[PDB]
Amino acid sequence: VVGGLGGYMLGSAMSRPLIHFGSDYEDRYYRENMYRYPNQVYYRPVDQYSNQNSFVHDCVNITVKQHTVTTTTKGENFTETDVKMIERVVEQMCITQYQKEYEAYAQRGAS
């Protein structure tokens, strides 16, 4: 199990995000299963933890890991594209997560 990441929390929730992958079918291969994704993501404070860039890639990984171990405990492994299907969503949801901090870290944060 996990149980001591550092400063992380779970949020509250959101909806599913909308990502336009590039291809017409990439835009759908994720959508045809989107209900399998959660409403939350795990995240930590900003406190300038290596920009947003070298936080969001750590952020996604901490959430994707559970969707991983849920199935990888069997040993079905995970391809590069199947993680990317998830992590397009975990990026969006993580950025939304962090944007509630961004207003206070920045000045406005806007939307």
**In order of start, what are the domains of the chain with their CATH numbers?**
1-111 (1.10.790.10)
Residue with tokens 């939350």: 40
Count of CB atoms within 10 A of residue 64's CB? 19
Element holding 83 (H helix, E strand): helix 80-105
Sign of the four-CA dihedral 83, 88, 66, 8:
positive
Element holding 65 (H helix, E strand): helix 53-72
Which tokens go with 83? 């993680």
**What residues does 42 pair with on adjacent strands?**
10
